[PDB]
Amino acid sequence: FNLDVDSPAEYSGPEGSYFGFAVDFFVPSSRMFLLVGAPKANTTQPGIVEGGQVLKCDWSSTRRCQPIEFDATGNRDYAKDDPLEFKSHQWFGASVRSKQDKILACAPLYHWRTEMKQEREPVGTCFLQDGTKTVEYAPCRSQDIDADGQGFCQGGFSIDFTKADRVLLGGPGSFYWQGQLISDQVAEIVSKYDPNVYSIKYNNQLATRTAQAIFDDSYLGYSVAVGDFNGDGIDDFVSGVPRAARTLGMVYIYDGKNMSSYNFTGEQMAAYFGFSVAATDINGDDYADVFIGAPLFMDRGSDGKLQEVGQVSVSLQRASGDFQTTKLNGFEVFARFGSAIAPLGDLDQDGFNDIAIAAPYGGEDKKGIVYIFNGRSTGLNAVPSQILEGQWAARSCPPSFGYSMKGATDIDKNGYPDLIVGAFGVDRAILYRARPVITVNAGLEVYPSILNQDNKTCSLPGTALKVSCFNVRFCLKADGKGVLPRKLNFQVELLLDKLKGAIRRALFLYSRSPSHSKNMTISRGGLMQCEELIAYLRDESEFRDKLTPITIFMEYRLDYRTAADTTGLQPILNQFTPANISRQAHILL
Amino acid sequence: SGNTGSIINNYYMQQYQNSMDTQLGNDWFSKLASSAFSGLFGALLA
Amino acid sequence: GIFPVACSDGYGGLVTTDPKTADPAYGKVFNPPRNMLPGRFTNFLDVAEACPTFLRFEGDVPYVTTKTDSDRILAQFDLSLAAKHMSNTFLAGLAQYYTQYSGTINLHFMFTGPTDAKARYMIAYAPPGMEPPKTPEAAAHCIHAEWDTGLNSKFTFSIPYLSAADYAYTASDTAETTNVQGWVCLFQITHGKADGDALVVLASAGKDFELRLPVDARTQ
Amino acid sequence: TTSAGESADPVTATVENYGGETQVQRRQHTDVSFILDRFVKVTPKDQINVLDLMQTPAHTLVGALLRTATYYFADLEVAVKHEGNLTWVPNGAPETALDNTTNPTAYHKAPLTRLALPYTAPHRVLATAYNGNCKYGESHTTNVRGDLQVLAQKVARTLPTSFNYGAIKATRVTELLYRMKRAETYCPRPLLAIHPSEARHKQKIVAPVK
Amino acid sequence: EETTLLEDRILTTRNGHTTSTTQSSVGVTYGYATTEDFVSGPNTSGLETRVVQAERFFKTHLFDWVTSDSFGRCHLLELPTDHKGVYGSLTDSYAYMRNGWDVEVTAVGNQFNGGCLLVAMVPELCSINKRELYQLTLFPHQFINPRTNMTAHITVPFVGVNRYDQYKVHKPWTLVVMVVAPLTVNTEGAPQIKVYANIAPTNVHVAGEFPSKE
Ligand SMILES: *[C@@H]1O[C@H](CO)[C@@H](O[C@@H]2O[C@H](CO)[C@@H](O[C@H]3O[C@H](CO)[C@@H](O)[C@H](O[C@@H]4O[C@H](CO)[C@@H](O)[C@H](O)[C@@H]4O)[C@@H]3O)[C@H](O)[C@H]2NC(C)=O)[C@H](O)[C@H]1NC(C)=O
Ligand SMILES: [Ca+2]
Ligand SMILES: [Ca+2]
Ligand SMILES: [Ca+2]
Ligand SMILES: [Ca+2]
């Protein structure tokens, strides 16, 4: 709910280049950047149309997106007049993943001629860059070729880094589309690199071997995620297998130490269970929780009609080894809710991690929608605290706002993690910043709250007659984490007999008015400020209504314009926190 | 020679019923199963 | 006049297995000479005796490995041509076209491990009527043979044809006499440093093995 | 009985090795000539039917036992239910011939017509498998699975087109049956059974009273 | 054989001017026939001739038998192979040939290996199946069991539908070497083991000499 929507950072590219098909953050060692994948972008590579490139987008100052050269060369040759590879339309940048100084991008549709017969097989390839270093990583480009081997693997279709600096790579086409999970440590990927060897063997490689023919066409490695699930510290391998179990879809979890086999399964046919997966601890118990997406899931309404809405299965990891699976349905028909699932870290800094789920083909004019879900003790709060809308219309391929997204990165050092949303259909990429969260301890006391109409204590200047008075007292105290002003000015509003066109039976003494406002300026983390004043009851023969309680209402508004900082990022007040409170007072008889 | 549970012989000459064989100039797997070493090979005691 | 004949009813219909020959249509053809070609076999059971073929065990392998534990049961399966272990033998692929058999089945046990690996095995025949044995000490009261590995690496045991009737079925229907002819239980008495070896096992037909009454069920 | 394991010499044992006695046996039902001398049903084409024996279903009695031999000889007997006259033409004859009546033609006589046909191949013996130029012999390098595999069923196999007994043609051939006479066989080949899913292939045998 | 693990079953084979001695022998296996059938037939008009220089051993490599190879691993060698000797200059000189084969397969690893190979001569091998390997002993075969032998010697005649063959379009025989029990290298076994063939044609007859661009 704290994401900035007023002026979010927009980035663009060449039209038709699919700018925004993949996005990530790049934090090296002390400037901050943005990585956008444009798998259809033309390059200056010799005789390669739409080779695809990855762009490093400068967040600092201007909105410049400088392309990154992983490979500037053309198609290498196997022999004389015999090309070895086909980088044309290789979709490089279809998947981009970064960890510190290491940037990994891949080309799922990179084709490669065998070292034997003249073939054209999509083994896929990747380019790993470590600052000044840059190697090639094509684990599926091996001696095992042609369909039943790794020939149609399309390695790099999905990628992820582990905490022990180990690469997780998925290829949905290995062994007649059984799919394959391939994991290599970043050490050997560069250490065993050889520009003259096309099929590099890595000594410490973990991989899923070929299985029975009944496992064919399952698409393992379609999507990947990392997290620990056996409690040994090492990130394990979570992958979606959307065609497994006769198109019911499955999700496999392997051990991140030896590729040893939990297994999730879908409830509906062809709902694409496993199209996307995500692993993040959502309930603060430091146990990685599994999120699985199924954008094609159909739900029934009160009319009992099937409607494709999409579904995400939230599986909470218990210490028992079991899971506490919760299903979260989509909101718009044919919007494909759950196409992308992005862990956000603690977006609001409340103590629990948060997550974002997108319906890329939702919203007005099929612009796209991203839903923000906050985590808590019980699990994931199923109601979205914020709804991010696309702002761009279609051209041929729909805007696809939310098709890919990345979060959990404090890119502006405000103490709050931000979010990138890619809309490749319109070649755009959008960065939403997180506004600082201000918790506020507002107070209101009415004493005495049982008013004696014949008390008549407080005198009233101007007249010799005294009135039945009492004290109203309101207090403010606010504090927040991250970067935010130490001074906070509020606008407090007070109304007596809020319940009442009708006559108000109480008003403030030193104003003779039921309404009173107070420009209050408190300090962040500082003590509680509290100003009180005297209110009095009207004369007994001024109204008949003596049974209805007099409600005292207090309301406050923060000055957002003056609370802004540098770029103009205005803080926000905590959700589920009442912006106003009310106490009452009775009269006796 | 083949399938007979009866013996009604032939109206016709062999020259018309079948095709006649020609000589130029039970064989193998009957001699191979008959040369099978059946006897015990050790020094039988008791 | 001419010869009177009574054309009988119920006679003369085509029977797909009648001992009658068709009428010629085309005469005086001489074949190319084929005398003394190599490999002539006249009887399907002559090839099933001169040529043993492998059995099939857990994991689809023709061998059974030497287990080292309190268990000593290598294989234990129904004496039935329709068994799973017998399913890839030529003797069971040829017996699927007959309804009854009789006689002896030979099992050939060839030991494969190295020269310093030594073992002792035991094959027994449990007749039907009570459960098959689970230890070699209980199976020593059956008809058994016991051998150990040495210079000669193959041992052959003949499963005896015990039955109430002279013939037994080659198929299996329910728990019934003719389709359960007992069991055949392979044990491992001892072994010395024979860990993970293999004892490949074959099977063939005995001297008096017989197989009669052709039939065509399905599935070559 | 112990013996050299790899001698490949046939080693039979008996029940005399532990006190039995080998009984006499009758083996007339596994004789090659006896067992292959049955009619077997073949799926016929509409009009023209080249008379190849490898057109028999392989799961049948005569089909499975014929394919258990590399080379074979036999005269052929044919039973045909047809409409109109049925013409036969020997091995190596043109197709246009199937139209001419001088070739052996059997006029329609209900219900069917069975003919004795000789062996007319140029070869001393026919074959069920013929290595023209196929398998390299090294695990078939793992290649084909998926859609093409049904087409890939027949690719590794084949036959010369002189391995036949001629052709038959009628206006409409309804049913066709082959019967092998004087069957000789050479060089036996593998023969497989049904692989069970249970520990034993159970089935439904005919059930009288008791 | 011998009273100890040491082994003395000597067998020598001379084809032409080339010999081959083995001390771990099991005997020669004859397949489908011991002699030849009639060479002179009605299909060569008496123009067949015997070439005696072509009957001698030639060597070839089959495969490495490693411990990772499990049951069913095949190696198929179609005979006649690509031959650079005088037997090779017969398929370029003459149109029809016929011959038997004298096949001797060798797998040397010491007697502290386990495992078992099955070498077999298969006629007309157009296609092999995983289940058909269980019945591979229907053909002329011998096992190679490292505890007992290293050699398998298989002699075999000419088979075909025709009396003479056109080897440029037909390979009648096929040498298949199958793993029936995987290799083991226990403590003292040889780590891998290479499999070699030592083949020699027998009774080679040729007929019909083709023209020459020489
Ligand atoms: C008649 O009218 C007069 C004038 O309006 C009323 O005066 C009030 O008296 C209250 C009790 O003394 C007083 O409460 C506050 O001040 C007290 C000391 O004078 C102090 O003890 C209180 O703290 C405690 O008070 C809270 C109040 O909610 C209680 O909940 C706790 O239990 C403690 O007692 C308060 O700080 C009040 O400020 C004062 N107001 C005024 C305007 O004079 C008087 O109560 C009326 N009496 C009748 C007839 O009801
Ligand atoms: Ca782990
Ligand atoms: Ca958790
Ligand atoms: Ca949170
Ligand atoms: Ca921020």
Author numbering:
A (entry chain A): 1 to 29, 32 to 263, 265 to 503, 506 to 594
B (entry chain 4): 15 to 39, 65 to 85
C (entry chain 3): 1 to 220
D (entry chain 1): 1 to 210
E (entry chain 2): 5 to 218
What does the paper say about this structure?
FMDV, a small non-enveloped RNA virus (genus Aphthovirus, family Picornaviridae), exists as seven antigenically distinct serotypes and many variants and sub-types.
The VP1 GH loop, to which it attaches via interactions with the RGD motif and downstream hydrophobic residues, is extended up away from the virus surface. Unexpectedly, in pose A, additional density was observed bridging the integrin to the virus surface (for both PanAsia and O1M). The quality of the density and lack of density in virus-only maps, rules out this being adventitious attachment of HS.
